[PDB]
Design a protein around this ligand. Structure first.
Ligand SMILES: CNC(=O)CN1Cc2ccc(Cl)cc2[C@H](C(=O)Nc2cncc3cc(F)ccc23)C1
Ligand SMILES: CNC(=O)CN1Cc2ccc(Cl)cc2[C@H](C(=O)Nc2cncc3cc(F)ccc23)C1
Ligand SMILES: [Cl-]
Lengths: 296, 305
C-alpha cells in the first residue's frame, strides 16, 4: 500500500556526471564512453566555438582531470571528445520524449549529484523542476530493465520559474532558444490521461468515494476537458488505460464521468491519495509499475 | 526556482542491496563490509508470526540455511547473530562498494530517502518523513521488507530505517539499523494499530518559509502570536506542539526572509482558520509537513525573491 512520486534509482547516472568549465562558466556534463555531453552555452555559437581549443575546456570527473582531445557541436549540445572512456558507462540510449511522459531528474552542481526527483514534460514543453544556478547540464532519464534512456538535459529557467532544456541530441523541447531574450512558457494544460491513471491508482489503494454509476462518451467528455483546460483525451489514451480498467473493473469512460463530476463540483473537502488537487504527473505505466514492483 | 520533494541520489545505497532467502521467505538485506543486515522475521513462516520465539527459531538454523545473493553472485554466510529485531549475517566477502556510513536513529519529523527493493533489486526512490506516530507513509508491496531509509549529507550515508511491516491502515513500520523499532510496534502479527497522527508543525513553518524565499507572501498577515496561544490553536487542528527548540531551529530561515517565527506562526494560525481560498502554496492546495528546516535550507536559494 501507499502511493509516492517515485524516481528511478539514480546510481547508473551518478557514475556519468562530470564538471565542465570553460573560462568563467562552470556547469555539468554527461560522460558516456569517450564523450562528454553538455549545453553549448558553456562557451553565434559556431563563431564562438571556432576560437576555442581543446585545452580551453576543463573537465573534472571526481578528483581526476580528464583531457579533452576534440570538440564538436550537435544542435544545442557540445560534445567533448576525452582521452578516457568512462568505465562506469551503463547500457544506454538517447530518446526524445513526448509531453505527458514522465522522467527522473538527477539535479547536479559542480559535477556532483545533489538530488533526485520525478517530473513530467508539460504539454507546454516546460518542466516544473527544482534547479538553482549551476544546475545546467543536469539530466532526465528513465530505466528500461538495465538500459538508461536519456531524455533531457537542463539548459535554462524561464521567468515564471519553470525550466527548459533539450533531448541528448541538442534539440529543444518547446519553442525555446539558448540565449538571453524575451521567452515565456505558453499557457499550460492538465495531462488528462495521467489524471485518469492516478484515479485508477487511488481505486487500487482503496479510495473509491469519487466513483459513480455513470458513464460518458469520448465526444461529451472532450467538451468538458476543453472547458477546464485539460488536454484532449484520444482513443490511444483509452486503449492505454485498458489494463487498469480491467484490473479495477471500471471502464475508462466510467472513470471519465467521475473526473467530469470532480471538475464540475470539486472535492468537497475530501482528498485522493493525500492530495486536494488532481495529480497529472503519473503516467498509466508509472501506476502499473508502482502497483506491481518492477525492479532495475 | 521551484520546490520539489527531493530524494538523495541512491547510487551509494544500490551497491549495498542484496537478496536474503531462508527457506520459503525471500526479502532484502543491506551488505556493508562483511555483514548483511536484514529483518529477523526472514527466519519465520506466516504461522510463526502470531507469537514467534525468535531465539528458538534462530538456534535451529545453521549458516548454510541462509542464502545471500548479490547480483548474480552467491555470498557464503560464515556466521549469524541477532541484535534486537535485526539479523546480522557474517559473510565471506566484504562489499567492495561499501560507502562511508553511519547508523543513526532519527526523531519524528525527520525526513529521509527510501530505496524500495524487491529480490535484492532496487525499483524506486522516494522521500518521506518519520510521522509523529512513528509510522511512515511509504509505498511498499510484499517483498519490500529490508528496504532502507537514509540521508547522504556530504559524502557519508546515514542509514536510519529498515522496513519490516505494513499496518492495517496501509502505513509502514520499521527499525533503526540496530534493530530497535520506531514506535510501540513489534515484529509479530498481533492487534497493532498506528496511533492518531498529527501534523509536523515545525516542518509546515519551514515550508511556508520556502514559499516566501521562492516569492510568495499572500498568506502572511500583520499579526503576531505568543508561543502558547499558537499551541492552543494548533492543537485543535491536530498539529504537533511547537517547542522553543523548533523556534530556535527556524532562526536562520527567519533571518533570511525577515519574518519572525512567531509572525510566521500567526500566518499558519490564519491559514488553518480560513483555508487557501482557491490558492496554492508551492503548487500545493494542502499544508506540506514532509520538508524539514534543514531540507528547505538545502534545496532553496540563499537569496530570497
Ligand atoms: C533566470 N536566469 C537568468 O536570469 C540568467 N540566465 C540566462 C540564460 C540564458 C539562456 C540560457 Cl540557455 C541559460 C541561461 C542561464 C539560466 O537560465 N540558468 C539557470 C538554469 N536553471 C535554473 C536557474 C536558476 C537560477 F536562479 C538562475 C539561473 C538558472 C542564466
Ligand atoms: C499486510 N501484510 C500482510 O498481509 C502479511 N504480513 C504480515 C507481517 C507481520 C509482521 C511483520 Cl514484522 C511482517 C509482516 C509481513 C509484511 O507486513 N510485509 C509487507 C511489508 N510492507 C508492505 C507490504 C504490503 C503488502 F501488501 C503485503 C505485505 C507487506 C507480511
Ligand atoms: Cl533526527
Amino acid at each position: 500500500s501507499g502511493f509516492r512520486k517515485m524516481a528511478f534509482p539514480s546510481g547508473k547516472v551518478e557514475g556519468c556526471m562530470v564538471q565542465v568549465t570553460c573560462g568563467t562558466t562552470t556547469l555539468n556534463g554527461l560522460w558516456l564512453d569517450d564523450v562528454v555531453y553538455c549545453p553549448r552555452h558553456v562557451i553565434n555559437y559556431e563563431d564562438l566555438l571556432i576560437r576555442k581549443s581543446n585545452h580551453n575546456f576543463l573537465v573534472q570527473a571526481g578528483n581526476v582531470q580528464l583531457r579533452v582531445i576534440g570538440h564538436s557541436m550537435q544542435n544545442c549540445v557540445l560534445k567533448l571528445k576525452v582521452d578516457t572512456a568512462n568505465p562506469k558507462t551503463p547500457k544506454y540510449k538517447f530518446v526524445r520524449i513526448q509531453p505527458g511522459q514522465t522522467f527522473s531528474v538527477l539535479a547536479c552542481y559542480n559535477g556532483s549529484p545533489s538530488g533526485v526527483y520525478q517530473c513530467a514534460m508539460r504539454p507546454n514543453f516546460t518542466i516544473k523542476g527544482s534547479f538553482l544556478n549551476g544546475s545546467c547540464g543536469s539530466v532526465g532519464f528513465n530505466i528500461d530493465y538495465d538500459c538508461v534512456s536519456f531524455c533531457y538535459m537542463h539548459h535554462m529557467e524561464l521567468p515564471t520559474g519553470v525550466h527548459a532544456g533539450t533531448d541528448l541530441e541538442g534539440n529543444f523541447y518547446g519553442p525555446f532558444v539558448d540565449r538571453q531574450t524575451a521567452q515565456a512558457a505558453g499557457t499550460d494544460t492538465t495531462i488528462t490521461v495521467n489524471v485518469l491513471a492516478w484515479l485508477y491508482a487511488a481505486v487500487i489503494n482503496g479510495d473509491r468515494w469519487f466513483l459513480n454509476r455513470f458513464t460518458t462518451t469520448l465526444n461529451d467528455f472532450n467538451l468538458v476537458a476543453m472547458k477546464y483546460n485539460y488536454e484532449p483525451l484520444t482513443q490511444d489514451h483509452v486503449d492505454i488505460l485498458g489494463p487498469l480498467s480491467a484490473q479495477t473493473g471500471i471502464a475508462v469512460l466510467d472513470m471519465c464521468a467521475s473526473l467530469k463530476e470532480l471538475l464540475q463540483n470539486g472535492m468537497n473537502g475530501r482528498t485522493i491519495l493525500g492530495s486536494a488537487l488532481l495529480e497529472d504527473e503519473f503516467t498509466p505505466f508509472d501506476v502499473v509499475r508502482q502497483c506491481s514492483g518492477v525492479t532495475f
